[PDB]
Amino acid sequence: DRPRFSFSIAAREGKARTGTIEMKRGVIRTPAFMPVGTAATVKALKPETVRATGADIILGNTYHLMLRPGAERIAKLGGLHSFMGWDRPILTDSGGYQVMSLSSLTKQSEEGVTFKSHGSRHMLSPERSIEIQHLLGSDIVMAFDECTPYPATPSRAASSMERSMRWAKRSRDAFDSRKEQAENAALFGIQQGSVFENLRQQSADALAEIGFDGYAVGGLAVGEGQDEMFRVLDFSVPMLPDDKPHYLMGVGKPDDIVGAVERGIDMFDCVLPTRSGRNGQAFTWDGPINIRNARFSEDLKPLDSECHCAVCQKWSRAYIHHLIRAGEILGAMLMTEHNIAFYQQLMQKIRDSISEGRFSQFAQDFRARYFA
Amino acid sequence: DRPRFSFSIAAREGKARTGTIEMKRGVIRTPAFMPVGTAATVKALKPETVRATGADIILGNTYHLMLRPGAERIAKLGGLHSFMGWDRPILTDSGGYQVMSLSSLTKQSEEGVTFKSHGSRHMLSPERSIEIQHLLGSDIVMAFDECTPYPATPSRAASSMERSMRWAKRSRDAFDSRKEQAENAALFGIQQGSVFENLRQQSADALAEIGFDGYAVGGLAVGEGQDEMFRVLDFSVPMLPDDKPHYLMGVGKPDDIVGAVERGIDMFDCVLPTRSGRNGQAFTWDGPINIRNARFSEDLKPLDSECHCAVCQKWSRAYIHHLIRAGEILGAMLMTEHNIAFYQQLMQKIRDSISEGRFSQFAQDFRARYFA
Ligand SMILES: CC1(C)O[C@H]2[C@@H](O1)[C@@]1(COC(C)(C)O1)O[C@@H]2CNc1nc2cc3nc(N)[nH]c(=O)c3cc2[nH]1
Ligand SMILES: CC1(C)O[C@H]2[C@@H](O1)[C@@]1(COC(C)(C)O1)O[C@@H]2CNc1nc2cc3nc(N)[nH]c(=O)c3cc2[nH]1
Ligand SMILES: [Cl-]
Ligand SMILES: [Cl-]
Ligand SMILES: [Zn+2]
Ligand SMILES: [Zn+2]
């Protein structure tokens, strides 16, 4: 039987790594892309379809599930895995992004954050966030943090990061004090510090002193743009323990993922393939296309000329164009399945190229064609 | 290889019949339920899922496809079957329902009907309707008629029926004058006459004199209610040729279908399982339920306790309740798959019970439990 948590690096090229995380509910191949399932569903896909595209793990969200259908309710129903019909690992974000994005609904203190609906109130704290993730039965539990807004002054970034590090210790202690959770799930810490190298170093040092199963780079994908994100990754990822997974939260476009892997990231999640798929954007090896465009109305080619997904084996651009134009649910289903399959094929090509020592060439070839 | 069209009755009980229609693209087991796919999609289902529920044939619509994506466009793309990925028989309605339901958008004459969008204009006539159905590649072509509004005076019902019979002859001649269509598709006539026995008889006589591969009972499911619909079926179905299929257009609820089979109907179509499924209504052998109701929020049972569909094998009422409440696409997908599977299981039970000479008992047992 598999351990609670083991991360093993099978091959490396520069800062890039490929390997596996073994957990009780399955193996995660890294670098990994996690489809987002915030409402206890990866939108428009059955779990079996999510798995068929190649996903090893999906992302849920403490904040959204706390509100609907409720954490205690999901626990009474047997946990999130049973509830939604996904039996493989699930990583749950802690709510720390919503601490920032919904801050106008919040009262924040050193104890935690209370959200007021625009009228019910719901509280999150390190202890309550970890508890909710336990009630959900999450396999990878994220520490409760604050995603620092961008831009941030050095003073405010420092104050925010310092609070997040205090909350990281409280998250660690809450997780460890629940024996069933500590024995069966993993806990990841989240590095903060905005774009400032000294603050990123202080945050990494604090997280490593506490000790976690994996380390997320938080506080990015907040409007900073790719050049700046890459600059921060350049110095921030080497600060994290080498022998544990590195998770870049909320990233991203295909070229973001490639460059982040070149900088040592092992795990990703993003709403882009699902959300923009429903909005008519399809990813291809020649760049994204908007299937709504009139130029596709009689195009019999599949969405992408090489993609192995079931959508590209059967249906034309012309048909999917019609469905999306018409607002048909099947349009959302087909676009989403293709985009998630595309993302998984990207991750597979990344893993294979690192394994074979040709990832740098893959990255250059990928960019040359994607941006042609 | 299968013929263009053969209908064979394998067993009978009273007025009820069970058998098969053989066509080039497949066999249709009767009594048959046709899922509705008006926009070149059975809403929220891949064609493979439609087939997995047991459907042998689906319904398309000349009027809707004429407008979007266009009949000539579908022909240029290889036909409706290729376009949507359903390779089995498709029956297309002719537009005659929209002649009535959208009459405020129309100018009608003996030549046909012109529809004006609320600003483009689109014309339908016996000749153009048959041509569109050819361009779509429809397997069962419906004559172009007018669904008489309900209620109708005897005079207006007679005038409407008489025009429909003239249009039925024009439909027959247009179909026969297109060799590829005449050799590979079938043509059904549509009986009109509102609720009036003498007009229904005149219409049946006119259609039988022209000669069709099958005969629809038109002009029902227009607000008349079940008692009146059954009264009209009582005298109308025996007027149609016994050795050809009898198709009741737009019907209906499960108990409508059972009673219509008891009166000699072989084919049905209805938006109820798809549309009301998206709106949260699930069919069960104990009657319909509204999954949105708070009583289902923690109900771990499947939608129906006996249903063999994939939805009832995996997911709980509680999960589907959450999805529909949340407006999630997967909620529409799961409700729709279950409801279509339920309808197909109903048809299978009807076919088996007629084959075994116990359909009258099935109908009584079905009603006693469904309405308990
Ligand atoms: C609202 C929605 C769906 O969230 C997405 C997406 O839009 C959007 C809008 O701007 C883009 C960049 C395009 O991505 O930003 C979100 C993705 N960025 C992101 N997610 C994160 C999650 C995080 N969780 C925690 N606990 N802590 C963090 O520091 C953290 C940082 C993160 N950064
Ligand atoms: C607008 C929408 C989706 O069409 C459905 C459904 O709502 C709704 C609204 O009242 C109920 C009864 C509940 O069923 O009425 C429609 C189903 N009745 C029906 N469909 C027909 C199609 C027909 N086609 C032709 N060519 N000729 C006919 O005489 C004809 C008669 C029909 N009767
Ligand atoms: Cl999404
Ligand atoms: Cl529908
Ligand atoms: Zn594809
Ligand atoms: Zn079912």
Curated annotation (Swiss-Prot), chains A, B:
The active site is at D93, D269. Substrate binds at D93, S94, G95, G96, Y97, D145, Q192, G219. The gene is tgt. Binds 1 zinc ion per subunit. It catalyses: 7-aminomethyl-7-carbaguanine + guanosine(34) in tRNA = 7-aminomethyl-7-carbaguanosine(34) in tRNA + guanine. One of its GO terms (molecular function) is tRNA-guanosine(34) queuine transglycosylase activity. It comes from Zymomonas mobilis subsp. mobilis (strain ATCC 31821 / ZM4 / CP4). One of its GO terms (biological process) is tRNA-guanine transglycosylation. This is Queuine tRNA-ribosyltransferase. Belongs to the queuine tRNA-ribosyltransferase family. Transmembrane segments: none annotated. Residues 250-256, 274-278 are annotated as: RNA binding. Its EC number is 2.4.2.29. It is an enzyme of class 2 (transferase). Changing D145A: Abolishes catalytic activity.
